[PDB]
Amino acid sequence: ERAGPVTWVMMIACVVVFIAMQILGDQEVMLWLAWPFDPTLKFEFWRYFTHALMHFSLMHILFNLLWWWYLGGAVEKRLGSGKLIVITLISALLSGYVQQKFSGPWFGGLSGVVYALMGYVWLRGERDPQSGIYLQRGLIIFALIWIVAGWFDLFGMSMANGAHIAGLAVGLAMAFVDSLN
Amino acid sequence: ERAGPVTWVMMIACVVVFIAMQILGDQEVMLWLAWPFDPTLKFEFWRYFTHALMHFSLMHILFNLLWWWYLGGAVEKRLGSGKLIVITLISALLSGYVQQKFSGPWFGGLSGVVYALMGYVWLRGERDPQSGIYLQRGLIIFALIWIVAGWFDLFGMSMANGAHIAGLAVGLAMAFVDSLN
Amino acid sequence: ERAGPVTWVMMIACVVVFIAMQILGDQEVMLWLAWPFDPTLKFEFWRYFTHALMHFSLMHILFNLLWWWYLGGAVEKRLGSGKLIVITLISALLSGYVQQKFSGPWFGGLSGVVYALMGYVWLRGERDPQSGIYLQRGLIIFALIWIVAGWFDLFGMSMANGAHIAGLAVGLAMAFVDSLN
Amino acid sequence: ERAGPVTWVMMIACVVVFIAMQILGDQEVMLWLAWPFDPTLKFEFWRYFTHALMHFSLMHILFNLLWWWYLGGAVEKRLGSGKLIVITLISALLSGYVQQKFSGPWFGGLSGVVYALMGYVWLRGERDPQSGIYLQRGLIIFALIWIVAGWFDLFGMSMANGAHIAGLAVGLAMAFVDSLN
Amino acid sequence: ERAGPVTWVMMIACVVVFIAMQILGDQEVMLWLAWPFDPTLKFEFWRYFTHALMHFSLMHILFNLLWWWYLGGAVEKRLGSGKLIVITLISALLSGYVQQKFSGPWFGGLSGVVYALMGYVWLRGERDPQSGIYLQRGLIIFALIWIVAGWFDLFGMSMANGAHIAGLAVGLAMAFVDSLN
Amino acid sequence: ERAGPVTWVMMIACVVVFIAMQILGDQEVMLWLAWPFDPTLKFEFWRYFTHALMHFSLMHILFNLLWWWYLGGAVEKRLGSGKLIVITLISALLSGYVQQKFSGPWFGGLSGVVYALMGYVWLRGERDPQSGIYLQRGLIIFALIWIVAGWFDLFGMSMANGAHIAGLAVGLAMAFVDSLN
Amino acid sequence: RVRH
Amino acid sequence: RVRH
Amino acid sequence: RVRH
Amino acid sequence: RVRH
Amino acid sequence: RVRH
Amino acid sequence: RVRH
Ligand SMILES: CCCCCCCCCO[C@@H]1O[C@H](CO)[C@@H](O)[C@H](O)[C@H]1O
Ligand SMILES: CCCCCCCCCO[C@@H]1O[C@H](CO)[C@@H](O)[C@H](O)[C@H]1O
Ligand SMILES: CCCCCCCCCO[C@@H]1O[C@H](CO)[C@@H](O)[C@H](O)[C@H]1O
Ligand SMILES: CCCCCCCCCO[C@@H]1O[C@H](CO)[C@@H](O)[C@H](O)[C@H]1O
Ligand SMILES: CCCCCCCCCO[C@@H]1O[C@H](CO)[C@@H](O)[C@H](O)[C@H]1O
Ligand SMILES: CCCCCCCCCO[C@@H]1O[C@H](CO)[C@@H](O)[C@H](O)[C@H]1O
Ligand SMILES: [Cl-]
Ligand SMILES: [Cl-]
Ligand SMILES: [Cl-]
Ligand SMILES: [Cl-]
Ligand SMILES: [Cl-]
Ligand SMILES: [Cl-]
Ligand SMILES: [Cl-]
Ligand SMILES: [Cl-]
Ligand SMILES: [Cl-]
Ligand SMILES: [Cl-]
Ligand SMILES: [Cl-]
Ligand SMILES: [Cl-]
Question: What's the A134 CA to ligand 11 centre distance in angstroms?
Fold first, then answer.
C-alpha cells in the first residue's frame, strides 16, 4: 500500500534539504553538505554521503525522487529496510568517490543511488527470480532511456558522469553478489 | 474504476477553454473569462470563478489537470460530488480574490483549487482518518515539492502567488472544519 | 501484469535506434532509416515504416514510448498481438505518406502510430464496448490535450502535421471498420 | 554627431511605454494602446498607431530600437524630420491594418516601421543615389537576414507576419514614389 | 584610436578569470575571489573588489565588457586613468557591500561598476558639459533599457539587485561631487 | 567606406544558402553542400569548401557574418582581395578536414574561416606592424572570449571543435609565413 | 504578461 | 499570447 | 531541421 | 545559485 | 544533430 | 557550475 520507512525518510530528507537550499541559497548548503573540498573537512564523515541529498532544480529533484520512490520502495518491500540502507550507503559513497576523482567535489543528487537501484533491481530479477524482486519490462525501457540520457548528456544539465557509471556498476555488483547461493 | 462527474466536467471544461484559447487566441478568451478588470464587469459573476479554467501552455494545463484528476477524483469518490463542488467554488473565489489584490486581474489556472485540494486531502486524512480519505505518503512528498516550487518560483513561469497561498489556506481551513465532530 | 511481445519489441527497437543515433549521430541513422529521399531508394521497402523508429531528443522518445506502452499494451492484451501489428503497419505507412507529401522526407517518430492508437482505442470503446477495450475517461482528456498540442504546435518542436492527421484518421477508420458486426 | 528630434522622441516614447508595461503590467498597457479590439474603441484614433510603441521583452525592444536608431537617424539626417514622421505614420497605420486583418488586434512593436525603413532606405539609395541616403552593403546583408528571420519565424517569438509584409511594402512604395523626378 | 591601460587591464583580468572559471570550475574560483563568506576571510582584502571579475556565462561576460569598454574607455580618454581607477574601486566596494547585505556573498560581475559608469558619464555630461564627457543620446536610451532590465529582472538570470542600485547611486554621487566648481 | 568584393560575395552567398535552407529545408541543402559523406561524392570538389556556407539558426549566421564582415573587410582593405580569397580557401578546406576526422561530415558554418581570420589579423599585426593590419585591443578581448566560448562549449549549440582548432592554427600559420621578410 |  |  |  |  |  |  505505501513506501516503507527508509524510502520515506530519504524523500523527506531530500525535500528538507531542497527547502534549505531555496531559503538559505544553494552555495551555503553546498558548503555544509558537499564532498570534502578542502583538507580541513576530510573527517566530516557525513560529506561522503550527503552530496546525494542536494538537488538544483525542480526537474532534478522530481525525477530523482520519482525513481527512488519506485525502486527504493520495491527493494524495501521485497528485501527489507536494511537492504535498502546498505545499497544506499555503498552507492552514495562509491559514486561520490568516482565523481570527485573525474571532476572535483561540486556535484549533487540522488542519481548515483538511483542508477545503482536500476542495475540492482534489474539484475537481481534476472539472476535470482526467487528473490521476489524484478524490473517490469516497461520500466526496463525507461530505465534504459534514463541511462542513455545520463551517458549522452540529454538532460540539458551538466552530468555527474563518474557518479553515474560508478552507481550503475555498484548496483550490478551487489545484485551479482546477492544472487549467489 | 473512473473519475466521477465533477472531476470529469472540470477536465472537459478546461480542455474546451484551452481549445478556444488556441483557436481564438488567449487575450480574446481572457476578455470573456478573467476576474473583472473594469468596474463595468463587476456583476458578470462567472468571472469570479472562470479564471480557474484558463491555461497558458501545454505544461500549465497538463500538470494542473494531472493533480486535479488525482485529488479531485479522490475527494469525489470518498466524500461525494457535492463536496468537490463546494471546495472548488470556495477555493476558486478566494484564491482569485487574493491574487487580484496582490497583482491585479491578469491570471489564470486551476492551481488555487489544486493547492486547496492538496491541503484539504492531506489534513483531512491526518485529522479525520475515519473519513476514508488521505494523501498517500509518496504523494505528500510530491505535493510538498509542488508547494515549494510555486512558492520559490521554480516552474519557469510567472506565479500567481496570492492564489497559491489563499488556495492552500482554504483547503486546510475546510479540512479543519470538516474534521470537527 | 506486463507488456506483450509486440509492445515490447517496438520499445526495444526504438531504444536500439535511439542508442545508434547517439553513437553514430542522427544524420547517419536518418540516411539508413528515413522515408526514401532519392529515387534510388524507392525499393528499400523498410523505409516506408522505419521513420517511426527514430526519435530526436529525450522528451521526444519518452513521451512517444509512454503512450505506446499504455495504448499498444492495451490493444495487445485485449485484441491480441496480430491486431497491434496491423494497426502499427497501416498507421506507420499512411502517416509517412501524408507527411512526406506535405513536407518531404525528413521526419521521424512513433507519433503517427500513437495518434492512430488514441483514435482507435477511444472509438472502438465507444462503438463496440463488448470488445473489452476502451480509453478511460481521464486518459481521454490527456489524449485530447496531446492532440491539441500536436495540432497547435505547443511542444516546442517542429511538428509532423501530416503524420499526425493521417495517423489519427487511420486509427478512427480502423475502429469504425472493426466495430461493424 | 547625434540622433535628431524625431529619432529621439520615438526612442524615449518606446522606453516610457516599456517602463509602464513593467510597472503596470503588459495587459493593462495593451488595453490603453492596442489597435481597437472592440467597436466602442473605433474613434480612439491613437490606437491605429500606438501598437508600434509596445514591446514585450528585452530582446524585442533592444533590436527594434537599434534598427530604428540607425535607419530613422539616417532618414532624419539626410531627408529631414518631416520625412521620418510621414514614413512612421504611414507604416504604423498600414502595418497595423494588415496585421489585424490576418490575426486580430493583439500585437505590438516598432518592426512594421523598421521593415518600412529597411525597404525605404535601400530602395531610395538604389533608385535615387543623389538623395544622399543609402543602405551600406554590410547592413543590406543584416537587413536581409532580419527579413528572412521575420518571415520564417526564426526569432523564437510569435511574429506579426501581416505587419512585416505590409511595412516592407510601404517602405518600398514610398521610396519608389520619392525617387520619381 | 584605442582603449587606455585601465580599460584594457580590466578586460584582460576579466577574461583571465573567466578562463580560470572554465578550466578550474566556477565554485573553485568563487572560493578564492568571492566577497568574504566566512569570518576567517575578513582580512583577505582583495575579496571586497574581486567579485567584480567573475562572470558566469558568455552573455554575462560579453555584455558587461561591452559596456565597460565603451564607458570606461570614454572616462579614461576624457578624464584620465586615475579617475577610472577610483570610480572602479568605489563602485566595486560599495556595490558588493549592498549586495551582500540584501542577499549574501554569492554574486559576481562587473555590472555594479558598469551601472556606476552609466550614471557617472550621463550626469557629469549633464551637469558639467565642459568636462568633455557625455553619454550620447542613443546610448542614453540603451543604458536606460539596461537599467530597466536589471531592475525588473528581464535578463533571464538571477540579478544582484543590491549591487545594481548601489552602483548607479555611486556613479551619480561621484558625478555630482565632480561637477562642483 | 565599404566592404570589398570578396567580403561582400561571401556574405551574399551565405544569405542565399540560408534562404535556400529555409525554403527547401536544411537536410536537403546539406545533401548538396556538405563535406562528402559517401565515397560516391569524393570528386564533387565544391563540398570540401561549401560546408562553410551553411548556417543553422539566426544567431549562427548573424555572429559568423558579423565577424567575417569586420575581419574579412579589414584583410581585403589592407592586404587585398586575393589575400582574403586564399585565407578563405585554406581555412575552409583544412578546418573541414579536421572536423570530419574528429566527428564526421555533418557540420557547417563560416567559423573555421572566422577563427582563422582572428588568428591571422592578430598575429600579422603583432609580428608585422608595417603590413597596416592589426586587431584593435578591444576586439582582441572579444575574439578571445569567442575562442573560449567555442572551446568550452558556451554557445548553447553543438560545436565543430576540429574546425575551430584547425582554423585558428591555419590563420596563425599563415600570419607567421606572411610576416617573414 | 500573465500570472500562472 | 501576443504577436511581435 | 527535422519534423517530429 | 549565483546572482549576476 | 549538426555541429556548428 | 555544478554537476547533477
Ligand atoms: C531529516 C533531515 C535531514 C537533513 C540532512 C541532514 C544532514 C546531516 C549532516 O549534518 C551533520 O550531522 C552530524 C551528525 O552525524 C553532526 O555532528 C554535524 O555537526 C552536522 O553538520
Ligand atoms: C463545458 C464548457 C465550459 C466552457 C466554459 C464556460 C464559461 C461560462 C461563462 O459564460 C457565461 O455564462 C453565463 C451563464 O451563467 C451567461 O449568462 C454569459 O452570457 C456567459 O458569458
Ligand atoms: C531490434 C532492432 C531493431 C533495429 C531497427 C531495424 C531496422 C531494419 C531495417 O534494416 C534493413 O533490414 C532489411 C531486412 O528486411 C535488410 O535487407 C536491409 O539490408 C537493412 O538495411
Ligand atoms: C513621451 C511619452 C509617450 C507615451 C505614449 C503616449 C500615448 C498617447 C495616447 O494617449 C492618448 O492621447 C490622447 C491625445 O491625443 C488623449 O486624448 C487620450 O486621452 C490618451 O489616452
Ligand atoms: C591580470 C590577472 C588578474 C587575475 C585576478 C587577480 C586576483 C587577485 C587576488 O589574488 C590575491 O592577490 C594578493 C595580492 O594583493 C595575494 O596576496 C593573494 O595571495 C592572492 O590570492
Ligand atoms: C552566390 C550564390 C552562392 C550559392 C552557393 C553555390 C554553391 C556552389 C556548388 O554547386 C556546384 O557548383 C559546380 C560548379 O563549380 C557545379 O558543377 C555543380 O553542379 C554544382 O552543384
Ligand atoms: Cl507511498
Ligand atoms: Cl563528470
Ligand atoms: Cl478516469
Ligand atoms: Cl502574485
Ligand atoms: Cl510492462
Ligand atoms: Cl508538416
Ligand atoms: Cl545618438
Ligand atoms: Cl500574423
Ligand atoms: Cl580598443
Ligand atoms: Cl539581490
Ligand atoms: Cl559595408
Ligand atoms: Cl567536434
Answer: 11
